[PDB]
Every structure is written in structure tokens, then in C-alpha cells.
């Protein structure tokens, strides 16, 4: 019943492609409708309780493709802005994606900030609180994720589904 276009945004190496791979691979066990592609996936998630069918759009993170992004987030129900918690510049890039989406995205778009690679404990440069504060001020939510360990991966998609209209 409920189809939800979700766009992945973030700079090179943040974890876009890995995040959605982890999500869809772990959801295999639920035996729901799904599509596995190289750059697009669909995945129906039971969230209590109706059908949410996520239509997940991977994007090319190179800065030369930046100006194409609007074409992707057009009509999007949701966006996950991914950054690498071990990279200050990635977090800065994520801030600009947020500003841009606030200015140009559908008013109804649900936004999530994913602090990815949370599993790299020794290397973290961006703190939860500095990422949580930023999320609070701009009307989105923050969740630390790890595509590698699966930490909060299911939970970020679940949490967006809960915020959908």
C-alpha cells in the first residue's frame, strides 16, 4: 500500500552504498517484497503495523554530480544524509545537504542524519552531541550507524517509516 521514495545523500566514502546493502541483506530473513539492484533497491518493512515499501535511490557522491541531486530528491518521501563520523569534512558536507534539502526539498520529506562507521571507535572525530544538537536545530533526527556491524541500520529505516505521513 504505502510506497516511499528514499534518497541516499552524502559525500564520497561516507557509506551510502554500504548502508543500503546492509539494510536489504539483513531484511532478507523477513521474506518481504524486495528488489536488489546495483544502485536501486526496494524493501518492504513491517513497522507496526502496515506495509512500507522503501524505494531506495543510491546517488553518485562525486562533487561533479552535485548539481544533479535535485533530480533525485524530487518527490522524495525521505532522505538519509550519510556522513563518516571519523571525517570532519564529511560531516560538514552533510550539513550542506541538510541546508539544501530544507531549502529545495518537499516540505513533507522525512530527513535522517546517519553518523556512519560508528564502529571505528578510536578514529571518531564527530561527536554524538555535536551531531545530535545539529539534528535538533534543523528538525531532523540523528542516528549513529555502522553498515559494517549492522548497528542502527534496521533502526534508521524503521524510525523514518514511523515518521512518514
Amino acid at each position: 500500500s504505502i510506497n516511499a521514495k528514499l534518497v541516499l545523500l552524502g559525500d564520497v566514502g561516507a557509506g551510502k552504498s554500504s548502508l543500503v546493502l546492509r539494510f536489504v541483506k539483513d531484511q532478507f530473513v523477513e521474506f518481504q517484497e524486495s528488489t536488489i539492484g546495483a544502485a536501486f533497491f526496494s524493501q518492504t518493512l513491517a513497522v507496526n503495523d502496515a506495509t512500507v515499501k522503501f524505494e531506495i535511490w543510491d546517488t553518485a557522491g562525486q562533487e561533479r554530480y552535485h548539481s544533479l541531486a535535485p533530480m533525485y530528491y524530487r518527490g522524495a518521501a525521505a532522505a538519509i544524509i550519510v556522513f563518516d563520523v571519523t571525517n570532519q569534512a564529511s560531516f560538514e558536507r552533510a550539513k550542506k545537504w541538510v541546508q539544501e534539502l530544507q531549502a529545495q526539498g518537499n516540505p513533507n520529506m522525512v530527513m535522517a542524519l546517519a553518523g556512519n562507521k560508528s564502529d571505528l571507535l578510536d578514529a571518531r572525530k564527530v561527536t554524538a552531541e555535536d551531531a545530535q544538537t545539529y539534528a535538533q536545530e534543523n528538525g531532523l533526527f540523528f542516528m549513529e550507524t555502522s553498515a559494517k556491524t549492522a548497528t542502527n541500520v534496521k533502526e534508521i529505516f524503521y524510525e523514518i517509516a514511523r515518521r512518514l505521513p
Partner: protein
């Protein structure tokens, strides 16, 4: 059936305007999808069987309307020519390395097949048939990247590979009237079907058109003087 022929005749009696035409066509398709759903003939049957009927109706309608709605104003034709002119220069010198894609025998043979699928777009009138050329091209690329992911030990690039390969394939294909082909699909493919993977593939080629149309030295990793030399070489044919 009566609805359709009298729709089409009196439709074609309205003075042509791309926005009103496509608004009226999309409402008509959307009303017809509701009617199929409610018709004794389609009781209980799947969404496959319903989409099939919808598609038959689209092609039937759009085959009659094609000459009225396709590439039918100067703005569209000028952009068609401009985009063709550009690709015909850039395709002479752009290389895979420019877009960070590897020209292995494996990759190339798929790119060439993707290119050939895309080049069929001008054999068809129906939005669905035109679109299928794009989907077939994107599927070839999709399957190349999928097999690469089984065959290899690094993590899959995803869209970071998918888009530039599509940009490269489109530049190499240079299908005549690409700008008008894309607008026509966007206007006349019934809206309920331009969703999901098909929309992801379609937006990708739309975004490739935008990139290609805007290509300069920097966007294809070339310095100014080399790009100008190449464009000059390309212009001399």
C-alpha cells in the same frame, strides 16, 4: 472503444499545447485505469493483467497523437539539435578514465550492448516502448555491476559506477532527438507507471542529459587547453 476514438478525434481538434495536452492525456489514462479496475472483464485479475490493458491503451492512444505531441515546437527541436551537436564532438574524445570507469573487455562489451539497446528508442512511438529501450540499457549496466560485485573483493561502487557508465553509454550512443524523447516519456508515460526502478532508471538518463549538456573541461577531468584542443579537433570532424 467508442470513448477512445472520439476522445482522439476531438482531442486532436483542440489547438496543440504541450502542457494542456499532457494534462488531458494523463487524466484520460487515469480515468481508464479506474474503469478497467471496475469492468466485469477484469474482475479479480492481477496488477500485471491490469497494467497490460493500461499499456495497450497508452500505445493505441499515443500512436495516433504522436505527430501532434512529439518534438512539435521550436524550443524542443533547438534543444534536440544543440544536444546532438555537443555529443557528436565530445564522443570523439571522452574516454572512460575521464569518468573514472575501467575499459576492460568485460565492461566494454556490456557498455556496447547498453549503447545498442538505447539506440532503439527511435524505432518506437509508444512512451512505454521508448522507455523500455532506456530500461534495457540500464539493465545491461545493472547486471554488469551485479556480476562485478560477486567476482570481486572490494565493496560495490553502486551509483558511483552506475551513473558515469550511463553518461558514457549515452555520449557514445548519441541517440537522435534525445531531449524530445525524454520529455515525451515524461509527459506521456502514464504517471502510475513512472515509479520505482523504472523511475530510478529514467531519472538517471534525465540526469545524464543534464550533465552531458553541461559538459566542460573540469566536469570531464581535463584541463582547459586540452579540452579546447579536443573540441577543436572534433569540430574539424
Amino acid at each position: 472503444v467508442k470513448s477512445i476514438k472520439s476522445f482522439i478525434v476531438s482531442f486532436s481538434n483542440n489547438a496543440p499545447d504541450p502542457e494542456k495536452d499532457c494534462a488531458m492525456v494523463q487524466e484520460f489514462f487515469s480515468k481508464m485505469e479506474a474503469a478497467f479496475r471496475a469492468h466485469p472483464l477484469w474482475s479479480g485479475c492481477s496488477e500485471e493483467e491490469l497494467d497490460s490493458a493500461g499499456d495497450g491503451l497508452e500505445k493505441y492512444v499515443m500512436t495516433k497523437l504522436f505527430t501532434r505531441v512529439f518534438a512539435s515546437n521550436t524550443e524542443e527541436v533547438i534543444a534536440d539539435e544543440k544536444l546532438f551537436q555537443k555529443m557528436s564532438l565530445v564522443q570523439q574524445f571522452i574516454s572512460p578514465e575521464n569518468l573514472d570507469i575501467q575499459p576492460t573487455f568485460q565492461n566494454e562489451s556490456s557498455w556496447l550492448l547498453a549503447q545498442k539497446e538505447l539506440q532503439k528508442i527511435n524505432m518506437y512511438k509508444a512512451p512505454r516502448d521508448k522507455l523500455v529501450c532506456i530500461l534495457n540499457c540500464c539493465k545491461v549496466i545493472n547486471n554488469l555491476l551485479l556480476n562485478a560485485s560477486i567476482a570481486s573483493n572490494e565493496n560495490a561502487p553502486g551509483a558511483d559506477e552506475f551513473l558515469p557508465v550511463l553518461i558514457y553509454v549515452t555520449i557514445k550512443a548519441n541517440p537522435p532527438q534525445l531531449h524530445s524523447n525524454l520529455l515525451y516519456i515524461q509527459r506521456y508515460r502514464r504517471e502510475s507507471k513512472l515509479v520505482g526502478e523504472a523511475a530510478y532508471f529514467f531519472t538517471n538518463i534525465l540526469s545524464a542529459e543534464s550533465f552531458i549538456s553541461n559538459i566542460d573541461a573540469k566536469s570531464i577531468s581535463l584541463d582547459e587547453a586540452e579540452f579546447e584542443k579536443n573540441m577543436e579537433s572534433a569540430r574539424a570532424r
